[PDB]
Design a protein around this ligand. Structure first.
Ligand SMILES: *C(=O)[C@@H](NC(=O)/C(=N\OC)c1csc(N)n1)[C@@H]1N=C(C(=O)O)C(=C)CS1
Length: 445
């Protein structure tokens, strides 16, 4: 470890700004690891600690940053031969500083106090991860202290903290998507030949097939005053029973297939950070399909996967493989690796993506306009999702997935407010949407 810290570890950057760097000190271990904006960028940088090793990009990009990478071997030979102070390479992330900061700020101020949860922002056309925010976060400088008691004290606090600040909730945790999954259910129906004009129950209540359990609209009210409403109307109002019906209408196989087509239940590629796989669930019977269609039962998404659903639709039905590293550089800033966009797959046809765009543009119009950007057409879907063993008595997760401008999209976001500000009245529109809108606003400057 003394030799590792004798040489200058390279930089992790975003938008030509520093997220992690090393300063030369008078320490036994010469180089101190510094994180100038610690909590904001901790999901991205992770930490690099004498006692506790590394995480995130400090771990993922370790050989580049310490200079042991075989693509850097030539520089290291040239350094020694010339008597130059050896330096590691740079990791240039895809993170947009202003979108990352606004996502962080909005999470700190958005739950009458700080929110628990995640914000992910994507560039739909490229797959760039523009923002990767998790809250609560932690200070990596604590773990970069060359003092062992400071590190040990921080480690003990972090691991005992029930709010689990070390968790990157954007990529490591999966959550029921709730009403946001109506985007998948709608895609499956649309691809099976249903139209925006399809007539679905407006009833406040719907029995589940083969069970006493019942699903209800919020809160026990019909979708409208007619016995049936159009799919479009049901979608913009986010009427539960309409989608229970539609999903059971469309059937298990078509829903499984559309969930797979949108990245669910296939192991995600690394970013190079490892992403938890999201799932639609086994869907054992029709009761389960009922609940699945509205984003419950065994449906579980990472925030990143939910933002990819939005990025896919925004990209005309084409999913770009998400990545966090734009380029790897050498100490002399010489390029070593430029990541290039690639199309993972086609989830929906261009026609279906266009129909979903319109439905989401309309769902955004129904939602509350707190945070609405003057003259920007946002396409969105909100969701508020039950979870845990006592779902009806627990504060739900607040969800918001969006893209903008819906006409020619430059950014897609997912906002997960975990346990919805610890409020039981929490909804995606109330909490998650303005947060979402703030990030979109930071993106479009
Ligand atoms: C979508 O998931 C749906 N939400 C619910 O029905 C709720 N729990 O079961 C999933 C629920 C609990 S509290 C609350 N407001 N909703 C619909 N989602 C929204 C939405 O867009 O966020 C609605 C406005 C209508 S209910």
């Amino acid at each position: 470890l003394l030799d590792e810290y004798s040489r200058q570890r390279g930089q992790i950057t975003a938008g030509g700004q520093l997220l992690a760097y090393s300063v030369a000190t008078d320490g036994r271990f010469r180089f101190l690891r510094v994180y100038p904006n610690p909590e904001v960028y901790a999901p991205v940088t992770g930490f690099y600690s004498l006692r506790y090793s590394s995480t995130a990009l400090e771990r993922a990009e370790d050989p580049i940053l310490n200079g042991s990478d075989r693509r850097l071997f030539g520089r290291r030979l040239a350094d020694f031969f010339t008597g130059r102070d050896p330096r590691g390479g740079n990791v240039d992330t895809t993170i947009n500083p202003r979108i990352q900061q606004a996502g962080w700020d909005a999470m700190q101020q958005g739950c009458y106090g700080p929110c628990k949860g995640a914000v992910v922002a994507l560039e739909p056309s490229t797959g760039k991860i523009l923002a990767l925010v998790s809250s609560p976060s932690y200070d990596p400088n604590l773990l970069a202290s060359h003092n062992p008691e400071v590190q040990a004290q921080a480690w003990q606090r972090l691991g005992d903290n029930p709010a689990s600040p070390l968790t990157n909730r954007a990529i490591s945790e999966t959550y029921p998507p709730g009403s946001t999954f109506k985007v998948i259910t709608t895609a499956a129906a649309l691809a099976a030949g249903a139209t925006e004009t399809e007539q679905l129950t407006a009833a406040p209540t719907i029995p589940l097939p083969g069970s006493t359990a019942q699903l209800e609209n919020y809160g026990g009210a019909p979708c409208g005053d007619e016995p049936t409403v159009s799919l479009r109307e049901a979608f913009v109002k986010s009427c539960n029973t309409a989608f229970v019906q539609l999903g059971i209408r469309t059937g298990a196989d078509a829903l499984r297939s559309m969930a797979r087509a949108f990245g669910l239940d296939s192991p995600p590629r690394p970013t190079p950070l490892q992403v938890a796989e999201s799932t639609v669930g086994p869907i054992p019977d029709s009761a389960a399909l009922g609940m699945t269609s509205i984003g419950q039962k065994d449906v579980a998404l990472t925030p990143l996967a939910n933002a990819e659903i939005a990025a896919t639709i925004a990209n005309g039905g084409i999913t770009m493989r998400p990545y966090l590293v734009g380029s790897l550089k050498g100490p002399d800033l010489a390029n070593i690796s430029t990541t290039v966009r690639y199309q993972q797959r086609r989830a929906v046809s261009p026609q279906v993506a266009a129909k979903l765009t319109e439905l989401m543009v309309g769902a955004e119009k129904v939602a509350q306009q707190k945070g609405a950007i003057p003259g920007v057409q946002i396409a969105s879907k909100t969701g508020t999702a039950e979870h845990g063993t006592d779902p009806r008595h627990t504060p739900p997760h607040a969800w918001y997935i969006a893209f903008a401008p819906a006409q020619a999209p430059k950014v897609a976001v997912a906002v997960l407010v975990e346990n919805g500000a610890d409020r039981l009245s929490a909804t995606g529109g109330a909490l998650a949407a303005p947060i979402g809108r703030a990030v979109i606003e930071a993106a479009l400057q």
